Amino acid sequence: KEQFRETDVAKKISHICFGMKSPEEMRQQAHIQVVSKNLYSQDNQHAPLLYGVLDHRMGTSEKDRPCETCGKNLADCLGHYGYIDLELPCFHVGYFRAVIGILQMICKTCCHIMLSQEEKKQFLDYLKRPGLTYLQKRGLKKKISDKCRKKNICHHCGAFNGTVKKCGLLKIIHEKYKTNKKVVDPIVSNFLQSFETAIEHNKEVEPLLGRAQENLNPLVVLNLFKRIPAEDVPLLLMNPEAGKPSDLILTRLLVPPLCIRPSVVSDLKSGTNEDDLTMKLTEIIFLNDVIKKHRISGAKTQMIMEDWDFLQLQCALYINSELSGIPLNMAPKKWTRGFVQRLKGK
Amino acid sequence: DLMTYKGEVLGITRFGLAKMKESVLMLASFEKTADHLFDAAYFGQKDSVCGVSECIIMGIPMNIGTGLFKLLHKADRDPNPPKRPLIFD
Amino acid sequence: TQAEIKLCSLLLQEHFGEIVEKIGVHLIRTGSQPLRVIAHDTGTSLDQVKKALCVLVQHNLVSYQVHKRGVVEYEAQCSRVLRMLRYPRYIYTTKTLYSDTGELIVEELLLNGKLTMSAVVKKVADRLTETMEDGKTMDYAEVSNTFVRLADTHFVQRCPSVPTTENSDPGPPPPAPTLVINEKDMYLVPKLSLIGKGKRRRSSPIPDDGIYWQANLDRFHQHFRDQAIVSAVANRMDQTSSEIVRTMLRMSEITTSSSAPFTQPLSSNEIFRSLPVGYNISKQVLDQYLTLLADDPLEFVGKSGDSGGGMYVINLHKALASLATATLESVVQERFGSRCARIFRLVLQKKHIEQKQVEDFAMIPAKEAKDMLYKMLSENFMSLQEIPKTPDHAPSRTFYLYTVNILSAARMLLHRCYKSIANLIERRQFETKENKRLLEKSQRVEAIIASMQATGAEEAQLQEIEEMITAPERQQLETLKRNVNKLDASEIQVDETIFLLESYIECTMKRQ
Amino acid sequence: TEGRSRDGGLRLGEMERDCLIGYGASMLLLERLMISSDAFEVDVCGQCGLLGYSGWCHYCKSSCHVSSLRIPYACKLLFQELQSMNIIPRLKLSKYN
Amino acid sequence: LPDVVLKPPPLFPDTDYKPVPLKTGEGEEYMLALKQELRETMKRMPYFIETPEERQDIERYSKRYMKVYKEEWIPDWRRLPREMMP
Amino acid sequence: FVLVEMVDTVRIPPWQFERKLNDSIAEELNKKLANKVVYNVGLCICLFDITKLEDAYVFPGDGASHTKVHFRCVVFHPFLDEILIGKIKGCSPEGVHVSLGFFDDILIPPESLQQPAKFDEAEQVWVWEYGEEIRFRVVDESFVDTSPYTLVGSISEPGLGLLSWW
Amino acid sequence: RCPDCGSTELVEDSHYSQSQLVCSDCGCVVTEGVLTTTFSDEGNLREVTYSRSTGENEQVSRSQQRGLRRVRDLCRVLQLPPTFEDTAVAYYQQAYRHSGIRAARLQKKEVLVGC
Amino acid sequence: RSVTGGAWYSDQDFESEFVEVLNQQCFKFLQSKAETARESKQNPMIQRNSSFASSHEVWKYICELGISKVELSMEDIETILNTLIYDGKVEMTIIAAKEGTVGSVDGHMKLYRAVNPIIPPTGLVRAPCGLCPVFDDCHEGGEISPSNCIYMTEWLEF
Numbered sequence A: 001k002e003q004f005r006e007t008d009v010a011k012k013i014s015h016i017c018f019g020m021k022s023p024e025e026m027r028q029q030a031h032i033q034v035v036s037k038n039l040y041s042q043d044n045q046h047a048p049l050l051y052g053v054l055d056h057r058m059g060t061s062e063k064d065r066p067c068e069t070c071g072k073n074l075a076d077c078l079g080h081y082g083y084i085d086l087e088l089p090c091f092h093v094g095y096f097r098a099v100i101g102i103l104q105m106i107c108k109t110c111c112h113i114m115l116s117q118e119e120k121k122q123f124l125d126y127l128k129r130p131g132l133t134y135l136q137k138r139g140l141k142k143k144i145s146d147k148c149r150k151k152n153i154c155h156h157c158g159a160f161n162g163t164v165k166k167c168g169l170l171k172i173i174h175e176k177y178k179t180n181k182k183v184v185d186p187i188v189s190n191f192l193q194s195f196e197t198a199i200e201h202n203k204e205v206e207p208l209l210g211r212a213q214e215n216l217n218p219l220v221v222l223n224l225f226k227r228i229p230a231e232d233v234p235l236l237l238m239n240p241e242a243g244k245p246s247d248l249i250l251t252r253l254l255v256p257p258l259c260i261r262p263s264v265v266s267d268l269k270s271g272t273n274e275d276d277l278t279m280k281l282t283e284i285i286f287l288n289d290v291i292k293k294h295r296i297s298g299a300k301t302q303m304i305m306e307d308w309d310f311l312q313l314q315c316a317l318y319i320n321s322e323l324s325g326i327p328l329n330m331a332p333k334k335w336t337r338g339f340v341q342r343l344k345g346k
Numbered sequence B: 001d002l003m004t005y006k007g008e009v010l011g012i013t014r015f016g017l018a019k020m021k022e023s024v025l026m027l028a029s030f031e032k033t034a035d036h037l038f039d040a041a042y043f044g045q046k047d048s049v050c051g052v053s054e055c056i057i058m059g060i061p062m063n064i065g066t067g068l069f070k071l072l073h074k075a076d077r078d079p080n081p082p083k084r085p086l087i088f089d
Numbered sequence C: 001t002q003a004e005i006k007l008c009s010l011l012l013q014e015h016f017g018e019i020v021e022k023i024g025v026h027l028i029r030t031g032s033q034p035l036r037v038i039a040h041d042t043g044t045s046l047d048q049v050k051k052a053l054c055v056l057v058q059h060n061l062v063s064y065q066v067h068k069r070g071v072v073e074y075e076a077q078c079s080r081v082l083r084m085l086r087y088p089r090y091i092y093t094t095k096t097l098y099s100d101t102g103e104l105i106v107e108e109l110l111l112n113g114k115l116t117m118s119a120v121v122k123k124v125a126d127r128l129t130e131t132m133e134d135g136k137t138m139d140y141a142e143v144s145n146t147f148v149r150l151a152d153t154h155f156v157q158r159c160p161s162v163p164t165t166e167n168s169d170p171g172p173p174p175p176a177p178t179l180v181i182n183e184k185d186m187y188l189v190p191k192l193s194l195i196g197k198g199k200r201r202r203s204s205p206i207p208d209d210g211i212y213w214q215a216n217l218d219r220f221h222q223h224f225r226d227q228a229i230v231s232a233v234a235n236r237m238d239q240t241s242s243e244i245v246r247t248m249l250r251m252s253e254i255t256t257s258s259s260a261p262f263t264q265p266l267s268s269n270e271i272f273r274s275l276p277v278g279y280n281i282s283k284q285v286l287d288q289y290l291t292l293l294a295d296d297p298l299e300f301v302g303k304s305g306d307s308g309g310g311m312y313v314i315n316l317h318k319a320l321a322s323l324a325t326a327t328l329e330s331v332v333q334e335r336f337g338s339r340c341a342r343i344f345r346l347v348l349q350k351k352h353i354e355q356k357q358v359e360d361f362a363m364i365p366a367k368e369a370k371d372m373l374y375k376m377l378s379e380n381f382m383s384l385q386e387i388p389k390t391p392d393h394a395p396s397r398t399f400y401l402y403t404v405n406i407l408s409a410a411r412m413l414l415h416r417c418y419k420s421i422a423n424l425i426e427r428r429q430f431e432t433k434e435n436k437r438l439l440e441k442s443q444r445v446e447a448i449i450a451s452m453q454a455t456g457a458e459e460a461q462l463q464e465i466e467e468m469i470t471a472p473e474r475q476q477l478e479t480l481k482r483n484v485n486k487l488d489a490s491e492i493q494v495d496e497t498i499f500l501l502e503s504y505i506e507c508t509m510k511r512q
Numbered sequence D: 001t002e003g004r005s006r007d008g009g010l011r012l013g014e015m016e017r018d019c020l021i022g023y024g025a026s027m028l029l030l031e032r033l034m035i036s037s038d039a040f041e042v043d044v045c046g047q048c049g050l051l052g053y054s055g056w057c058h059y060c061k062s063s064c065h066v067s068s069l070r071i072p073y074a075c076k077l078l079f080q081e082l083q084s085m086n087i088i089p090r091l092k093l094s095k096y097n
Numbered sequence E: 001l002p003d004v005v006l007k008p009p010p011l012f013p014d015t016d017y018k019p020v021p022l023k024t025g026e027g028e029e030y031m032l033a034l035k036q037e038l039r040e041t042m043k044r045m046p047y048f049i050e051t052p053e054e055r056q057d058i059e060r061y062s063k064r065y066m067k068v069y070k071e072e073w074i075p076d077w078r079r080l081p082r083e084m085m086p
Numbered sequence F: 001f002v003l004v005e006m007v008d009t010v011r012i013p014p015w016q017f018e019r020k021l022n023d024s025i026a027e028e029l030n031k032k033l034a035n036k037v038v039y040n041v042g043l044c045i046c047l048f049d050i051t052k053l054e055d056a057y058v059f060p061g062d063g064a065s066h067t068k069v070h071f072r073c074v075v076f077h078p079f080l081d082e083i084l085i086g087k088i089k090g091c092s093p094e095g096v097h098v099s100l101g102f103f104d105d106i107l108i109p110p111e112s113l114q115q116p117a118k119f120d121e122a123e124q125v126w127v128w129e130y131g132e133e134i135r136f137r138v139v140d141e142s143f144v145d146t147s148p149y150t151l152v153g154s155i156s157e158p159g160l161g162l163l164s165w166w
Numbered sequence G: 001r002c003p004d005c006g007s008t009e010l011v012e013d014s015h016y017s018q019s020q021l022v023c024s025d026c027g028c029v030v031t032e033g034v035l036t037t038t039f040s041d042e043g044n045l046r047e048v049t050y051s052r053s054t055g056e057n058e059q060v061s062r063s064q065q066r067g068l069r070r071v072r073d074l075c076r077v078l079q080l081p082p083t084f085e086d087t088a089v090a091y092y093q094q095a096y097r098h099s100g101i102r103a104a105r106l107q108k109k110e111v112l113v114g115c
Numbered sequence H: 001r002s003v004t005g006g007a008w009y010s011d012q013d014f015e016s017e018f019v020e021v022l023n024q025q026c027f028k029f030l031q032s033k034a035e036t037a038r039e040s041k042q043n044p045m046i047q048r049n050s051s052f053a054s055s056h057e058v059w060k061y062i063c064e065l066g067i068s069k070v071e072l073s074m075e076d077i078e079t080i081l082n083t084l085i086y087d088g089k090v091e092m093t094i095i096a097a098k099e100g101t102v103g104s105v106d107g108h109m110k111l112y113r114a115v116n117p118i119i120p121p122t123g124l125v126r127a128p129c130g131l132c133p134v135f136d137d138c139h140e141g142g143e144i145s146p147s148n149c150i151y152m153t154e155w156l157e158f
């Protein structure tokens, strides 16, 4: 007959469980995929473009037009999330330092946490102590970092690993082929000697033999994070229920409902005041589409890499529009208000 | 007594509040919201809602004051009433 | 290892049950763990934890260790859990190598983990009794001969032995017996003097105690590597050359450890005598074959010296890497195409290369090769160096060199195979579950025949078997069956591919 | 809104809430700062711990663990803003008894 | 200007490449039959922990007529720690 | 039918305080689970008994009473073998539509197993002859709230003989 | 319209700083409450125009930019109000839609600005 | 010719059909010669040698075909056969021929022979999971799932 549904339960919140979503759980959560970079239709009615930002299946911002996904009023509608697919993986500003630390905490080939088995067991025992606090967890991570950065080879692999550092703009560099004043490693000789064809087609490559090290792109670090063993996940201080380390690398973007993004149609003029976040979402869609176009048309590899970096910068600005390490020459636009700006400040 | 209940003299400064208290929301709201929130999420921290600050934030009645005790309506009731017996079993 | 954990959970749920697979998954995810925290975290009773642990350690899927204050911490062997998937291939290779008696021997060892002489010979004789009729009887003599042959071929090895508790620490017993493994008795077969015949299931003290025997899957994997290498050699150069390689590997089967970059030094003179008489060959033809295999760019074999005429050695790591590269090129060709395979092989030969160089060398015009490079880059098969002219390593001011690494691609492909097998098992189990009504229907229509099959089984009910409504439904059943069949076979085929990649992953790793 | 020029009501400064806490008027404080400022109704799935709509859970694709909860609208806005940053808040509900 | 997507990409983009037919021969069919028979043998063997039956309500004599019986194996307790005895 | 151990918190408004708590609880529960199928449970009918009735809390909100109650009520949920006797209220060509007597017209037998004269040619044919009984095959439930049913079950009629009616 | 009586006589009247719609026949309210932007937010948010949104204002070649700048400085030196500048630039942007006009010599563009 | 103009560059544009046709027909010649050598069965070493085709021989075969308007040189056919090598269907075997009909390589001569692929299509390609376009997006309970993955639908349907 009729499916019984309990309207309400007399419950009260006990605690909030913070945690990351996978870009895959992210895609599961979202209702529609945002593909239209442009906002409204060409007709004078200014109809919002379907499957794009400011669609009215995605929450609602105007009193007259209700939510299309949920049949509720502007006030009643809670809002629906959308998802945007990124053709290339992108770093996360909140998790940039985190990925740097993990890459310093695990190797690049064996990928396990890089400490002695006795050190691992001792840290596990100290972590088994009930009720570990936030400050204690930060101290634990710092202790593990200090004891891990003083070695070079993981127990599993034994591959040599140098220091990993941020170079410039959302860029991670690992000097695997360390230059030494002593005898050089055989692996270093193999790596340097194998530039035969590049030197053949470019003499200037040979002077660039040094200062040319392993840079960890978002895609390769995503692949590494996929293959992480579960055993080392607790040693990474990462609660498995909250999220797997692969979730830190962002390859999908949840666009939030129209409840957060206002569209103030200024009746005094022929325009609508719009949030900088919606503009940055439009720019992100444009960047993804133009990356697709350049991949189809076969542009320079360097041009594709610049497109990837500019996408990373766009996502960074969308997350936080106040960064001190952007592309000086590649001037974006002007000052904007990001999510952090909406959060912090008086 | 509050300032020394942990065995060490703890200030009323932001460092002190970070020390004796733990709530993620309060630490984020005090200063540097992005770093604190993202670090807390990275550590996968779970945060209770027993404190008054989050109770106001969460919109739930606080435990201090009138929100401490629970009320019970003295109605005419018979707990565990007589049971109609099944014959088939 | 998330896909590995998912596949292991599926396998353990399929093969042993639910409370066992829960404990196995918890151990895999958590590693070493004492028993009490295992029971608490899994939310299971103490007795169920005991049952899961015993049924797991009996099959050598998990082990235990002793730590400070005599605590017993249990650990899981995820690779060992994946190993049960290759049981059918082990059975097939034993059936091919030796008679079906050895096939049943290894099957019972796999299904029982470890067994004694008496237990295994009794089980094998019993299972061999029904395979035959006319009152003939199996004797323990042939079963014992086959088992000792298998053990001497190192396909069956002894369990770690229980240490003599009376010789060391007599008194308070440790929480665990703390078994130890002894190399010299892994193949020391004890004698069973008694010979008898197994009951044919009419349905109407222990001389071999303390010693248990298990399938040595390391021998199976070494033999499978042998088979793959000789198959590749036969595919490429000649059947006779592959025969020579197989003969020298067989010569080195017992003389070489399972983990060896090179084999023993073998001379062509003893190769000639060790070759079967079926291959009509001469000494000079053997020398020419061996020299040209040494000159084969695949460099499977190597001279390593001129003593004893033509002395030769094989390159285990190099051959495994070549096989892995061949498999990688095959799969990338099948999924992307022939021209992308050309690009992959081209960049394989040229370790560092620019994009226009690839276009010129592969003779692929613009807007076509570059899309393949971008795609095969995005699928994590490919890597870019980003050599800068400064050290800011930042924008359009650095060169990008294509460089493909075998190891990373092999690792990710192994992960992909794991997830694919997980998907196949999920699909087969879902299709089995959604059709369990028809499964029980077919079970009942066959039970009408089987139950009371000779006693009172009138012919006037044989025509009533199709009377049950499954007459069109059998169609569906057949489809399900073939799909099931197909899935299983496909999965088994994919399993072989894994043995390739993992082998490379195992040989490239030394574990210092 | 802000004030008289914008027909806005008065502002409960932090000190006023401090005094209210000192008195311990829990229900009065809750009513003043939630009911009289911004009241909203939300649905939470106990399984997922995530917000839901109209007694339905999209993430869990179910409606067997939904429940009603009164909330400040600012609190819901904060939850959604934190969701945008992929910092997903999972609410662990408990019975009032 | 790339064209605006009016209807999202399908749940399944059709593939130009088709899966290769599987291996054929006596060996493969023996593999399949062996695996399928192994399925039932491991189901019947006592190592297969049967799930506890539930939601059965009342008593009857017919319980004794549809009884399924199977023998129970035992592990070697000298190889097993004594802590795991039932 | 079958009893189910049902546990629920019941909210009683204050204007019924003069009555006994148990009777108001029973009335509200009857109003609350009447003609409402419960997912993976079956079609609830009416309350049978109240086993546990604990303290009646009052909340800082509505101000009414809330009591957590353990009790037992009857539901319809066959055990895949039960014999039913319903009436044919309609018959689609792909499958007849039987309705249990005044109970529910939601049990749909797909006509696929009676004597090999199986066809419903859309002029309302009960059966092809050589107050209708039922062997219930399966049960199924779903969440209808897919937009801001759910108990049908498959029904089979094999060659029972049916000497009373062909 | 009235949901019950059906009367379409809905009138807007200002309450004690509350905008709402009420039916004069049955005094029943059909819609109350209104959402308006605050000055603190209006000062931060940036207005967008149709041209820049659709991508226009970027297809302004060096010649058209020079022309509109000439129009601007010409109307400036004459000391005209901003409305005259707006109308002049609008007329210039309208005249520049012809193919024969844009493809002309500097003298043509200058006399066009003058006209 | 190396940096400007070029046989493949007509109007400074690469001739795709030229290289495709040349590769396919020279592979036809290589496989025909390999088949003739395989059916010769005279001797395994004679088999190996007669299977081989010299660069000058295949170049003359292309010239007698004369399909391409721009006459192809020795190194041009060498690069064509190298592209075939990159396809894995033929292999390169340099022999120590100090002089001969080629006479180009110092003390050696170029021999290309068609050989079978080392391994047929391995596993994971009989199942659509192998590098599926939505493999990364494939999920147990996502919008695309193996339960509703139309790749299984199609493959099992076949």
Ligand code: SF4
Residues within 6 Å of the ligand: C420, C423, H127, H128, H129, H130, H132, H133, H134, H135, H136, H138, H139, H144, H145, H146, H149, H150, H151, H152
């Ligand atoms: S979509 Fe289907 S075929 Fe493709 S990877 Fe996922 S489960 Fe495998």
Ligand SMILES: [Zn+2]
Residues within 6 Å of the ligand: A059, A067, A069, A070, A072, A076, A077, A078, A079, A080, D053
């Ligand atoms: Zn909504």
Ligand SMILES: [Zn+2]
Residues within 6 Å of the ligand: D045, D046, D047, D048, D049, D050, D057, D058, D059, D060, D061
């Ligand atoms: Zn949920």
Ligand SMILES: [Zn+2]
Residues within 6 Å of the ligand: G002, G004, G005, G006, G023, G025, G026, G027, G028
């Ligand atoms: Zn009215």
